[PDB]
Amino acid sequence: FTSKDTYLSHFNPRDYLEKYYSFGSRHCAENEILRHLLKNLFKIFCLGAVKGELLIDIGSGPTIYQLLSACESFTEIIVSDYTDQNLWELQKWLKKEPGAFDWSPVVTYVCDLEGNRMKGPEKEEKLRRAIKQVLKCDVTQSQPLGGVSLPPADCLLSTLCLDAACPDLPAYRTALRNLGSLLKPGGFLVMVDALKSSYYMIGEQKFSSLPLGWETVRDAVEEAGYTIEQFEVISQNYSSTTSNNEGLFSLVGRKPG
Ligand SMILES: Nc1ncnc2c1ncn2[C@@H]1O[C@H](CSCC[C@H](N)C(=O)O)[C@@H](O)[C@H]1O
């Protein structure tokens, strides 16, 4: 329902970050989902065979939480979003500008997950150096990155994006196919999204969401042309004032050879 143009005028990066990614004493349900996402991303990127040279994050928004473990496994990262103001928000953090969002408590939490073998600033410096380009993307487009000239990627990452960007299931499958064009044969697809979510709130701003159950997600990914290597259902809901999701999933898919 929510048109991509509504993002351009109505998506507020800072409101989004405070609601979802602040690690406060308030926003508990959001905090609990974030902890669970970070644990699953840690397992995916640090405990397995998900490694390579170039990772492309699709629909990054104004967030870097989804890259914190990934940068230990990929030395080159491209971040991308439909919304120019989300990109400025990432650029702020990338270049250590005043007004950049404070990721400190999330970085510390990831460093913990990873055995306190490094300090927060080392992790930040690594992630910053890894980010090779910040790009406009549109998942609905046959060439999602606008035909910017890139080598085939080793991994595509997409967190909490495709459900928001797709009005129905054929659109979802098409987005997955469009993304596939960026990925090398044998490459990895890593996705996180809400289950059975029809909306999410940013303050008073309501954004639509494609409500899918886990069986359907799995089928759609297989039908979009990938093989499923890992799949998890997360039993956590956002706040009643935030969303009507019934859990989330994380998955790892593979593009055929
Ligand atoms: N058609 C489209 N193509 C690419 N990104 C889109 C899109 N429509 C919406 N988006 C992006 O999808 C995001 C949903 S919020 C998810 C942000 C982030 N990856 C996280 O894990 O929290 C927004 O940043 C929005 O700009």
Tokens read off for 139: 């998942």
- Count of helices and strands (H, E) across the chain: 9, 9
3 state SS of 240 = coil
Strand order of the β-sheet with 153-159 is 131-136, 74-81, 52-58, 153-159, 183-194, 248-254, 227-234
Q: Which atom of ligand 1 is nearest to the CA of 66?
A: 21
Count other Cβ atoms within 10 Å, centred on residue 81.
26
Q: Does domain 1-257 have CATH number 3.40.50.10860?
A: no
Rounded CA-CA distance 226/4 in Å is 26
For the chain, what is the largest distance between any 2 Cα atoms, rounded to a whole number of angstroms?
47
H or E stretch covering 80: strand 74-81
Tokens read off for 18: 């405070």
Residue 248: phi and psi, rounded to 5, are -140, 170
Q: Which of 7, 86, 238 to mutate to test the pocket of ligand 1 (most atoms within 8 A of CB)?
A: 7
Ligand 1 in reach of 178 Cβ (< 6 A): no
Rounded CA-CA distance 229/97 in Å is 39
Tokens read off for 223: 């039908």
Where helices occur in 11-78 by DSSP H, the ranges are 13-21, 28-46
Q: What residues are paired with 134 via a beta bridge?
A: 79
Q: At a CB cut-off of 8 Å and minimum separation 6, what does 71 contact? A: 77, 123, 126, 127, 130
Rounded CA-CA distance 109/120 in Å is 9
Ligand 1 in reach of 137 Cβ (< 6 A): yes
Hey, where are the domains in the chain?
1-257
